[PDB]
Amino acid sequence: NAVESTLRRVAKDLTGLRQRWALVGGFAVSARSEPRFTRDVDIVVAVANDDAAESLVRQLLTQQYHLLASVEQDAARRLAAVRLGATADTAANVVVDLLFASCGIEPEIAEAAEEIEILPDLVAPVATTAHLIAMKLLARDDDRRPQDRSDLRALVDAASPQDIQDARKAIELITLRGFHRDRDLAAEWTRLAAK
């Protein structure tokens, strides 16, 4: 409700700014598999560099958002993501996460995303099932994020064989770019799948 209002708002704001963007997170998993409880908006935004990301964040802070946190890292792309606090709606305050260089394949995710009617009269770009599988494998944390393991099950159960292969190729690109850190994500996937 308030979450849905925030989604519509950030959707219209990013598109008006001509940003290459895609929904990830709960709305996207819900769209690709089984609707599940979602209380924030998670978006990938493909931009050229940190300077472009910061220019976009300053543009949003002139509108109905305030900055709650920045995620910075030692990589060539120092700005990984920002967390914004939305005030589109008035029942409760709602978080909006913008991901720039968090998983390392933000450009490919925005490019492969597909237009889907998420809400009545809201068509938004949604990450592919394969890209969501890759993202959830990377982000899985059972002490801090137990929804990831369940989301991953739902996504794999909803995927086609080609989706699975696309996910494995998405994992290799993440790894080629160093975003795996020290982890063999494909081997982790195999072991989770054995159950």
Numbering used by the authors: 2 to 196
Verbatim from the authors:
We show that MenAT1 can function as a bona fide TA system in vivo in its native host M. tuberculosis. Furthermore, the toxin MenT1 acts as a tRNA NTase in vitro, which transfers CMPs to the 3ʹ end of tRNA acceptor stems without preference for specific tRNAs. MenT1 biochemical activity was fully inhibited by purified MenA1.
To further investigate MenT1 function, we first determined the X-ray crystallographic structure of MenT1 alone to a resolution of 1.65 Å. The MenT1 structure presents a bi-lobed globular protein, with an upper domain consisting of a seven-strand β-sheet decorated either side with two α-helices, connected by a short linker to a second domain made up of a four α-helical bundle. Surface electrostatics show stark differences on either face of the protein, with a distinct electropositive cavity on one face. Superposing MenT1 with MenT3 returned a root mean square deviation (RMSD) of 3.829 Å (849 atoms), suggesting a close but not exact alignment, which likely arises from the relatively larger size of MenT3. Nevertheless, the core fold and domain structures are similar. Importantly, when all three solved toxins are aligned, the identified catalytic regions co-localise. This allowed identification of key conserved catalytic residues for MenT1, namely T39 (S78, S67 in MenT3 and MenT4, respectively), D41 (D80, D69 in MenT3, MenT4), K137 (K189, K171 in MenT3, MenT4), and D152 (D211, D186 in MenT3, MenT4). While D41A, K137A, and D152A substitutions abolished MenT1 toxicity in both bacteria, T39A remained toxic, which is consistent with the toxicity of the corresponding S78A substitution in MenT3. Noticeably, the MenT1 crystal structure has two MenT1 protomers in the asymmetric unit. In addition, by size exclusion chromatography (SEC), purified MenT1 was monomeric in solution. This fits with what is known for MenT3 and MenT425 solution states, and confirms that MenT1 is also monomeric, with the presence of two protomers in the asymmetric unit a result of crystallographic packing.
